[PDB]
């Protein structure tokens, strides 16, 4: 919902 | 569940004027059937007029909520 | 009561001090309305080219116009 | 029926409780 | 917005000269950076001094003021005119009255609604405001405007 | 100096007090009346109308009454070296109560109500109501 | 997929960045005769069309009833 | 056996909320008059309206208590 | 001429052939145009444009009151790069090189 | 030959609604007419000025 | 003189809350009038709109009480 | 019949609610007097009016308590 | 068929609990109109949204009253 | 019997309610005195009158808690 | 299992505190929109967060209620 | 003595209500002292007076608890 | 077997009270944001901590309710 | 151990009420500290005195709870 | 049979009351911070101290509930 500088696993 | 919530709200706003016109009407009808004298009738006329104004208020409220619930962007 | 009516606190204070000055005793009331007469001459401009000029001798018409 | 007249005056009327008498 | 206070009679030495000098300095300093300047004045002398040079910047002028003593022509009127014509920054040029043979020309940078809204006013948190700050600020600011003009013009007189 | 209350009660046309040492001072805030003494907190308040009541240290029991129309009050804590705590009561029109009248007061009230009976403008209605307030306060405060 | 049967449109954000988006005309005018009416100024309707339109100055309560 | 008395006393208990409402209303009236003493008739009028509503509800609950007692 | 407020409306429109076409355009070819004297005017045009943009934003945007943003597990390009700024940079430097 | 004018419906709806409409119309007879005729008056004024 | 009376009495506990709500409503109207009298007809209007809910709810409760007194 | 004690005591709760309302109204009068100590009379008037209504309600609650007690 | 009636009467308490809350909402509307009459709309919308929520809660409790009353 | 003690307990609840009202009323005295000490003993007299009325109500509650205990 | 229906009623009484909370929230929202209107975008957001909690709690108070009405 | 135990517990409930009422006094005292410390002792006096009343009520109800727990 | 059910219903009521407290916190936060917008982040964090504690209490109540439904 | 447990639970309810009352006092402490830090310790003092009553009552409550748990 | 469960539920209600009390604490916190951030850390410390006391009381209540559950 909020932009972040970290990318999760599923969204890799 | 949202559909059930919405239909409940919609039906309540649709029947609100029917209630104000019917069940409070039945109450007034009871009072009319029971009362005989003139003083009480003089005082009860104003209650009837209040019910008129109250019905129009409920109708306004229902109009507002129905134009809110039947407004679509597209 | 004034930010709703579109009125300033200075305008309200002046227009109320006027009434208070009207509720004074005559010897001091004379000196009060003396020391609190009004005389101004507003002159409105727009890149030169005067739009209007107007005199004022009353507080209410001065604040109104 | 048509509203005849050359007049631009927007005219409305108020009524009384008395009838016209000739 | 530059509010220049001056007189309406002559033979006043060179006080209005110094006032108009400071005003010219301020205008020429603030028009370089690109700030659009407006000019309010009090007295015909400033008008005659700045017409030919800065008459394309006049906004509103008052005169015939000090026929009587000062608060005859209440500062509240001029302050209301300023607030109605609310600028983003306001300067006030006048003459301070040091002693009977000595004065001094000054410029007062004055706070405006834009400069108040752009600050949270944490410096006044030490003070208790009996009505809330947000409701009493707008009524306090007009009083501040009026009082500022009042003392400045007394000193100039 | 001393552990007193340094009042200055001032209008534009006359400064009634400058550094007067007092004990307690009552003032009619916009919400309601309240009384400032030494040790009172730093505060700001808007005033509405009524009778300031000053009480000197030399007096104690004796008082001085002054009617105020509108203005502000500023109570400032005492400097460490002064030993004394200061207060500033600013009023746009500060009269004494000796100089007030109830007849011209009621006449002005009547004329205000007459002017405001034609209630059309918001500022006119507001001015009528506020004049009613202030004139009622004048009537209740005059002797 | 090949791309022959792709979506026959482009998203509104990309059109807005291209400077291409048009928002208007919930309705349309199919025929040029109908499009150029307000620009002709002298024959918005042909004569035949005028006399055909003169037959519908009022609604037909008779036809409604029937 | 005395269930009608129980029902009446349980129906009566809305007098607490009615009185709370009346107290809040007249408190608002008194405060608004202490603030604006030149405006008392309009405030009293609205207070009378509210008191009429609240006393109507109170007399309703008392009447229903009497009904349940002497049905 | 007679006074135009005395004149019958349908008779005036029968006389006038131009404003006939103006009415057909907005009230026969559409059913949702406002009943104002000038629907083609700039105020109406700009209001329609702003309404268009607000409607589309409310429908499509990621918000606290989301209409269409729902059941999201595989995101599209725009939302993916708007949420993951680290990947927009990496995917972009690679593209340019 | 009926009970229509002696009805609960009459006394509850017909007389109250009708009497209230009558009283409101009598009390706001002119306010209503003015609020309605405002637009027509303005339009007629505009037309006459344009013509002139 | 049984459980119906008890239920119709327990139904009446809501009238207290309804009265508190009405009191809050009209106290707010009083305060707003004392603050800015020049919008009386508006505040009164909104108050009546609120009553159009609150009254209705209370009346519902009263009716349901009678429905449980003669179910 | 000791059962009617229960009912009477239950009726007494309204006295608690009335007391809360009375306290709120008196508190409002006390603050109003502090805010505008010039009048101190037109506020006490409305105070007594409200205490009239609240005392009336308390009295009828007490009376109904005694009624349900003895009967 | 007595426990159903008692259950419904006990479920009717949230109506009174909701009337409080509607009262506060419309009181806030009144006070906001008194503090800023320049904004009449944009306050009534939020008022109607919150009132809609509380109306939904009222519908819930009345529906469940009728449910337990017949099931 | 012992059931009377439950009546006494309900009476105690009424006492708790009056206690709540009494405390609320006192708070206003404290605040009005801190704001305007000059009129102290007036606020005290007004509070005394309110306190006496509340005290009488509490005394009555206690009396009933005794009367529906011994009877 | 009538006690099921009673438990359910009790489990629905909680709506009286829920709606109260919601009311207070929206009241504060309206006050904020009447005090600092230019930041509605903040206030509404915070309000929605609060509703996202309160809604959830109310849904639980329904769900478990129905569970105790069936199981 | 189970009834006695229940009556004593209810008395405890009354004590809790009294404590709730007591909180108001010290809140008002703290606010008035934050405003004007120079009226400390007077405020303390009034506070202790009211606390005396509250304490009296508490002691009374506790005593009644003991009575209804033994006699 | 519904005696456990009543306990669960009571737990739900407690949860509702917690919800009311949460709403009060949200209302205070909104008012604070309106008064001091620039300090939202700190106020929001404090509210979050309070919300977490309240949520923990609510979960604890729901858990105990579930336990009381079976054990 | 039924009656005893119920009595203890009621006492617990009283303790919860005491906690509610305490909250008001500490909120007043926070506000007073916000407005006048220079007498922070003199407020803290008064708050401790408030505890010296409130908590003490709570202690009494819990002690009586244990007594009626082993009476 | 399930009296202990009923007692536990009552204790849970008390816990809910404690949560409601906490809400006022953190409301005052989020308000005094808005009114003076420079002393916010001190205000936070006071709020934490109050919160700890409230939590301690709640924990005590929970312990009592467990003891009641286990007789
Ligand atoms: C019980 C109902 C059963 C059906 C269900 C209802 C569904 C429809 C609902 C409609 C509701 C609308 C509301 C009423 C409209 C009122 C206003 C209006 O109509 O304006 C006048 C208008 C007159 O038109 P005009 O603008 O004056 O034009 C006159 C021209 O000069 C004429 O010249 P021309 O050049 O135009 O042509 C001449 C001629 C013939 O045309 C020609 O030019 C020659 C070609 C004709 C040959 C073909 C004939 C058409 C097809 C066959 C029809 C019949 C049998 C079919 C058999 C099947 C095959 C064997 O014109 C016509 O025949 C007119 C066609 C009539 C069709 C109706 C109008 C379209 C309305 C849309 C309705 C939606 C239905 C969906 C469509 C189906 C799905 C796609 O009235 C109509 O013509 C329509 C009649 C309305 C139908 C009656 C329904 C009752 C309404 C009840 C309202 C009251 C409510 C409360 C009741 C309680 C009372 C106490
Ligand atoms: C987005 C859509 C929004 C929709 C909103 C819908 C809400 C409004 C729904 C209300 C409908 C109620 C009207 C029907 C009830 C009356 C029946 C009737 O007419 O009796 C025969 C009436 C009464 O006649 P009578 O009483 O003299 O004798 C005969 C009566 N009968 C036959 C019943 C025995 O016939 C008339 O003569 C009527 C003439 C007067 C006009 C009456 C209309 C005014 C009263 C109703 C207005 C309601 C609309 C309010 C709108 C407010 C909106 C801002
Ligand atoms: C679709 C529902 C919403 C719209 C409402 C439709 C109209 C509402 C009907 C009128 C409401 C009151 O109706 C009134 O109560 C009931 C209705 O059966 C009747 O009461 C009668 O039947 C009930 C049966 O339950 C008996 O217990 C009662 O002793 C008997 O007098 C009254 O004779 C009627 O005057």
């Amino acid at each position: 919902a909020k932009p972040s500088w970290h990318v999760a696993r599923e969204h890799r | 569940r949202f559909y059930f919530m919405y239909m409940a709200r919609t039906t309540f706003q649709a029947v609100r004027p029917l209630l104000a016109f019917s069940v409070f009407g039945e109450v007034m009808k009871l009072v009319l059937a029971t009362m005989s004298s003139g003083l009480f009738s003089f005082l009860f006329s104003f209650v009837l007029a209040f019910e008129v104004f109250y019905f129009f208020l409920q109708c306004y409220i229902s109009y507002t909520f129905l134009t809110m619930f039947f407004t679509v962007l597209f | 009561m004034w930010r709703s009516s579109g009125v300033s606190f200075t305008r309200y204070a002046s227009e109320m001090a006027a009434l208070l000055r009207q509720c004074l005793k005559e010897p001091y009331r004379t000196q009060a309305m003396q020391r609190n007469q009004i005389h101004l001459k507003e002159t409105v401009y727009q890149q030169g080219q005067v739009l209007t000029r107007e005199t004022f001798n009353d507080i209410k018409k001065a604040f109104e116009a | 029926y048509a509203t005849l007249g050359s007049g631009w005056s927007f005219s409305k009327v108020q009524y009384t409780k008395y009838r016209i008498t000739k | 917005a530059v509010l220049a206070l001056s007189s309406d009679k002559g033979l006043c030495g060179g006080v209005n000269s110094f006032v108009a000098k400071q005003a010219r300095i301020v205008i020429k300093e603030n028009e370089m950076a690109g700030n659009a300047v407006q000019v309010y004045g009090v007295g015909d002398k400033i008008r005659s001094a700045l017409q030919r040079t800065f008459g394309d910047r006049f906004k509103r002028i008052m005169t015939e003021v000090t026929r009587f003593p000062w608060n005859f022509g209440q500062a509240c009127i001029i302050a209301d005119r300023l607030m109605q014509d609310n600028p983003a920054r306001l300067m006030v040029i006048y003459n301070h009255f040091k002693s009977a043979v000595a004065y001094d020309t000054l410029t007062l940078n004055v706070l405006t609604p834009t400069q108040a809204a752009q600050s949270a006013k944490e410096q006044l948190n030490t003070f208790e405001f009996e009505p809330e700050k947000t409701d009493v600020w707008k009524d306090l600011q007009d009083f501040y405007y009026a009082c500022t003009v009042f003392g400045c013009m007394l000193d100039n007189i | 100096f001393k552990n007193q209350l340094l009042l200055t009660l001032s209008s534009p046309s006359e400064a009634i007090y400058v550094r007067t040492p007092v004990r307690s001072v009552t003032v009619p805030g916009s919400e309601g009346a309240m009384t400032m003494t030494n040790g009172h907190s730093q505060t700001v308040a808007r005033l509405k109308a009524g009778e300031i009541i000053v009480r000197k240290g030399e007096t104690g029991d004796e008082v001085e009454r002054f009617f105020l129309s509108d203005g502000f009050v500023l109570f400032k804590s005492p400097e460490d070296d002064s030993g004394c705590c200061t207060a500033e009561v600013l009023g746009v029109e500060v009269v004494p109560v000796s100089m007030l009248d109830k007849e011209s007061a009621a006449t002005a009230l009547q004329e205000l109500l007459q002017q405001g009976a034609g209630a059309t403008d918001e500022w006119t209605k507001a001015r009528t109501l506020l004049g009613q307030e202030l004139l009622s306060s004048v009537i209740r405060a005059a002797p | 997929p090949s791309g022959a049967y792709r979506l026959p449109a482009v998203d509104y954000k990309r059109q807005l960045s291209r400077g291409t988006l048009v928002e208007g005309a919930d309705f349309y005018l199919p025929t040029a005769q109908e499009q150029q009416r307000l620009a002709r100024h002298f024959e918005p309707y042909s004569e035949q069309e005028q006399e055909e339109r003169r037959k519908f100055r009022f609604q037909s309560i008779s036809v409604y009833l029937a | 056996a005395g269930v009608a008395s129980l029902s009446a006393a349980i129906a009566l208990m809305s007098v607490g909320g009615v009185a709370q409402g009346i107290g809040s209303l007249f408190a608002a009236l008194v405060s608004g008059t202490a603030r604006n003493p030149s405006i008392k008739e309009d405030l009293f009028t609205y207070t009378l309206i509210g008191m009429g509503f609240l006393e109507f509800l109170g007399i309703i609950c008392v009447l229903m208590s009497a009904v349940l007692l002497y049905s | 001429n007679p006074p135009v407020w005395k004149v019958n409306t349908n008779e005036w429109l029968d006389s006038d052939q131009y404003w006939q076409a103006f009415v057909e355009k907005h009230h026969f070819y559409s059913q949702y145009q406002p009943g104002v004297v000038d629907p083609e005017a700039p105020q109406e045009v700009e209001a329609f444009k702003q309404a268009w943009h607000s409607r589309m934003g409310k429908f499509n945007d990621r918000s606290d009151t989301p209409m269409l943003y729902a059941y999201m597990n595989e995101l599209p390009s725009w939302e993916y790069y708007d949420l993951h700024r680290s990947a927009f940079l990496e995917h972009m430097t690679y593209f340019l090189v | 030959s009926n009970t229509v004018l002696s009805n609960a419906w009459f006394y509850s709806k017909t007389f109250p609604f009708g009497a209230v409409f009558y009283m409101l119309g009598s009390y706001f007879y002119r306010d209503i007419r003015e609020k309605l005729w405002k637009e027509e008056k303005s339009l007629i004024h505009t037309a006459q000025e344009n013509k002139n």
Side-chain angles (χ1 to χ4, degrees), chain A, chain B, chain C, chain D, chain E, chain F, chain G, chain H, chain I, chain J:
Chain A
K2 246 143 88 82
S4 85
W5 195 263
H6 174 248
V7 179
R9 173 66 91 206
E10 60 268 30
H11 299 313
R12 183 62 272 179
Chain B
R1 64 190 184 279
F2 290 104
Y3 304 115
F4 294 105
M5 294 164 180
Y6 295 151
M7 64 174 57
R9 281 154 57 70
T10 301
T11 60
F12 173 51
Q13 296 295 338
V15 303
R16 172 197 289 273
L18 185 68
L19 300 193
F21 199 84
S22 291
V23 310
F24 304 156
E26 201 84 44
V27 171
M28 297 293 131
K29 282 177 181 223
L30 278 168
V31 176
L32 290 174
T34 54
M35 82 199 194
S36 60
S37 76
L39 184 54
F40 182 87
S41 315
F42 183 82
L43 301 169
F44 186 65
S45 56
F46 307 113
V47 177
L48 295 169
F50 176 85
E51 289 293 300
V52 177
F53 282 98
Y54 194 78
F55 168 76
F56 281 114
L57 189 71
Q58 297 297 298
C59 275
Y60 169 76
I61 286 156
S62 67
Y63 172 84
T64 296
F65 274 110
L66 287 174
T67 185
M68 276 159 67
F69 299 164
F70 285 95
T71 289
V72 304
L73 304 178
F74 305 89
Chain C
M1 324 193 67
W2 308 278
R3 299 266 83 86
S4 80
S5 306
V7 178
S8 158
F9 182 72
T10 56
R11 188 170 175 186
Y12 149 79
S14 307
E15 291 192 30
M16 287 300 302
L19 291 171
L20 172 53
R21 282 203 303 277
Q22 277 185 353
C23 318
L24 275 161
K25 291 199 158 142
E26 268 288 327
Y28 307 120
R29 185 168 155 180
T30 44
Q31 300 176 16
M33 299 291 192
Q34 163 51 24
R35 295 187 297 200
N36 289 254
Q37 308 154 289
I38 295 165
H39 182 37
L40 305 156
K41 173 164 179 152
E42 193 195 356
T43 318
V44 189
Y45 280 61
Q46 187 70 282
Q47 194 261 325
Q49 311 145 14
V50 164
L51 312 187
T52 180
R53 322 188 186 73
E54 53 265 66
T55 53
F56 300 121
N57 292 73
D58 191 7
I59 192 71
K60 300 170 173 159
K61 314 201 186 309
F63 276 120
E64 174 268 340
Chain D
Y1 287 79
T3 313
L4 317 180
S6 305
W8 275 86
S9 198
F10 176 76
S11 82
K12 293 284 190 191
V13 293
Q14 53 168 319
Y15 63 91
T16 74
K17 59 177 284 194
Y18 311 119
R19 288 202 205 191
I20 289 156
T21 53
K22 297 285 193 208
Chain E
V2 176
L3 176 60
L5 304 177
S6 297
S7 178
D8 57 355
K9 302 190 182 212
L11 320 188
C12 50
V15 307
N16 300 344
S17 78
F18 279 110
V19 164
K21 192 176 156 281
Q22 198 85 34
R24 287 156 189 157
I25 289 153
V26 164
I27 293 155
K28 297 163 182 162
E29 282 170 8
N30 265 286
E31 283 201 330
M32 285 302 284
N35 300 324
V37 169
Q38 302 215 325
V39 164
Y40 299 79
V42 174
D44 59 359
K45 290 278 156 178
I46 194 76
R47 158 161 62 174
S48 58
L50 299 177
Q51 195 87 38
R52 72 213 195 99
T53 315
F54 296 116
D56 68 332
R57 299 159 175 83
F58 286 9
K59 187 67 174 174
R60 193 181 269 90
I61 284 153
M62 304 289 283
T63 193
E64 300 214 312
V65 177
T66 323
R67 175 161 306 290
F68 310 122
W70 167 219
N71 213 16
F72 282 79
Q74 294 182 0
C76 289
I77 290 149
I78 290 144
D80 282 11
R81 292 281 148 72
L82 270 298
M83 194 68 77
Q84 293 159 15
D85 300 317
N86 180 32
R89 57 177 294 177
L90 184 79
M91 214 167 288
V92 169
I93 299 162
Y94 77 113
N95 270 292
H96 181 57
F97 171 53
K98 306 199 147 160
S99 170
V101 309
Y103 64 84
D104 197 65
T105 313
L106 284 157
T107 81
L108 271 184
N109 310 280
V110 166
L111 196 82
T112 65
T114 55
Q115 296 149 269
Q118 76 192 60
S119 191
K121 300 173 262 286
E122 57 259 39
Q123 303 88 350
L124 313 180
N125 282 340
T126 54
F127 276 85
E128 292 179 22
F129 291 71
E130 171 60 20
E132 196 208 342
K133 192 181 283 184
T134 60
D135 59 53
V136 74
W137 186 249
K138 288 181 196 161
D139 296 331
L140 178 63
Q141 207 178 4
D142 311 342
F143 205 67
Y144 169 55
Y145 269 42
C147 297
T148 299
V149 172
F150 185 63
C152 284
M153 177 47 92
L154 294 163
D155 285 5
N156 200 341
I157 286 154
Chain F
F1 182 71
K2 284 182 179 182
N3 290 87
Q4 312 200 259
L5 179 60
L6 283 152
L7 184 76
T8 182
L9 175 62
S10 311
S11 64
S13 312
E14 196 189 10
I16 292 151
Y17 299 123
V18 175
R19 295 291 181 184
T20 295
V22 305
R23 267 165 180 176
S24 86
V25 186
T26 294
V27 289
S30 72
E31 302 297 337
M34 64 184 179
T35 294
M36 292 178 180
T37 76
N38 196 344
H40 210 294
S41 170
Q42 294 180 0
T43 186
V44 180
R46 182 177 86 203
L47 319 181
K48 60 190 181 184
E51 42 181 6
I52 298 148
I53 296 158
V54 190
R55 312 192 186 83
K56 270 71 74 175
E58 72 188 309
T59 53
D61 304 308
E62 199 273 335
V63 300
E64 269 288 8
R65 277 184 168 75
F66 295 104
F67 204 85
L68 184 136
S69 164
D70 197 323
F72 277 81
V73 67
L74 301 160
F75 196 98
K76 275 184 287 193
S77 77
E79 301 298 337
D80 56 338
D81 65 336
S82 67
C84 208
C85 197
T86 194
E88 299 116 317
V89 180
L90 320 175
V92 186
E93 195 76 70
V94 166
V95 192
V97 178
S98 43
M99 312 190 180
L100 275 170
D101 167 40
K102 300 173 173 200
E103 316 309 330
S104 60
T107 291
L109 182 62
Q110 181 262 306
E111 294 170 11
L112 184 88
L113 298 148
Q114 186 64 277
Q115 191 64 31
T120 291
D121 189 66
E122 57 200 29
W123 173 227
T124 302
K125 299 178 284 205
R127 193 168 73 76
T128 295
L129 279 161
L130 289 148
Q132 283 179 37
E133 295 293 326
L134 192 147
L135 298 159
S136 305
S137 307
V138 173
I139 287 152
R140 293 205 315 267
Chain G
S2 64
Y5 308 112
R6 66 195 300 180
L7 198 147
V10 176
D11 55 277
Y12 78 102
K13 302 189 158 174
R14 194 172 289 117
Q15 283 169 353
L16 195 71
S17 86
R18 286 164 170 194
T20 296
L21 187 77
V22 180
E23 294 108 322
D26 263 13
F27 65 97
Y28 74 113
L29 303 151
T31 310
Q33 180 67 12
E34 298 162 352
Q35 293 160 9
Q36 303 301 334
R37 284 202 204 288
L38 269 53
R40 275 183 261 151
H41 289 94
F42 273 90
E43 287 299 340
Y45 301 93
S46 75
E47 302 297 82
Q48 203 274 340
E49 209 157 14
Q50 277 182 22
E51 304 106 13
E52 292 291 349
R53 308 243 305 166
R54 283 184 223 295
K55 298 194 299 220
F56 308 109
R57 298 189 289 220
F58 315 94
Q59 287 154 246
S60 277
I61 201 177
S62 306
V63 163
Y64 179 23
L65 186 67
Chain H
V3 174
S5 86
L6 276 159
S7 293
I10 285 156
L12 194 78
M13 284 149 44
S14 87
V15 172
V18 163
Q20 283 195 220
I22 295 157
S24 73
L25 184 81
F26 272 81
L29 165 62
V30 171
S31 88
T33 297
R35 157 171 284 149
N36 188 305
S38 89
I39 295 293
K40 296 189 285 185
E41 312 183 342
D42 274 298
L43 306 180
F44 191 74
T45 293
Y46 303 148
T47 287
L48 284 187
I49 296 164
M51 191 73 210
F53 278 101
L54 296 156
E55 183 65 13
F56 177 54
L57 299 161
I59 205 80
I60 284 159
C61 79
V62 172
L63 193 162
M64 198 71 73
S65 182
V67 165
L68 301 154
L69 181 58
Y70 290 106
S71 69
Chain I
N1 285 135
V4 77
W5 69 270
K6 278 176 163 65
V7 170
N8 191 241
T9 315
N10 212 27
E11 283 179 347
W12 171 71
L13 205 78
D14 194 1
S15 86
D16 187 83
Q17 284 288 329
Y18 187 88
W19 300 113
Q20 270 191 34
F22 194 80
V23 169
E24 206 192 1
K25 193 203 165 141
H26 294 287
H27 296 116
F28 169 72
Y29 287 104
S30 194
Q31 296 282 124
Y32 300 115
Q33 287 289 83
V36 295
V37 61
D38 206 338
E40 291 187 353
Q43 289 76 236
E44 289 76 357
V45 172
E46 185 55 43
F48 186 84
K49 291 184 184 180
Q50 295 298 331
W52 196 96
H53 282 290
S54 68
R55 289 155 43 201
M56 296 295 280
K58 191 175 160 49
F59 183 67
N60 280 294
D61 289 349
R62 165 169 49 72
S63 49
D64 213 329
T65 302
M67 283 202 175
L68 186 73
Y69 199 88
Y71 314 107
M72 278 285 141
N73 313 126
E74 313 191 339
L75 302 166
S77 182
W78 199 96
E79 301 287 3
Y80 183 92
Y81 293 132
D82 182 26
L83 297 172
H84 310 291
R85 311 305 194 80
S86 172
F88 170 73
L89 191 70
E90 293 148 25
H91 295 185
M92 176 50 112
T93 62
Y94 193 92
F95 163 71
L96 299 166
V97 177
Chain J
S1 290
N2 52 48
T3 317
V4 162
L5 308 177
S6 298
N7 261 0
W9 177 268
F10 186 75
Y11 295 126
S12 298
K13 308 291 163 46
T14 307
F15 180 86
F17 281 73
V20 166
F21 299 152
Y22 190 88
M23 284 197 302
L24 292 177
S26 180
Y27 198 78
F28 304 108
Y29 183 73
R30 316 208 157 183
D31 303 77
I32 292 160
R33 299 295 193 291
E34 292 157 20
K35 202 155 166 182
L36 293 174
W37 301 339
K38 198 188 283 174
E39 197 193 15
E40 182 147 27
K41 282 172 78 70
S42 77
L43 291 175
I44 289 153
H45 181 280
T46 290
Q48 196 169 27
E49 296 290 337
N50 288 352
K51 191 203 177 77
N52 299 135

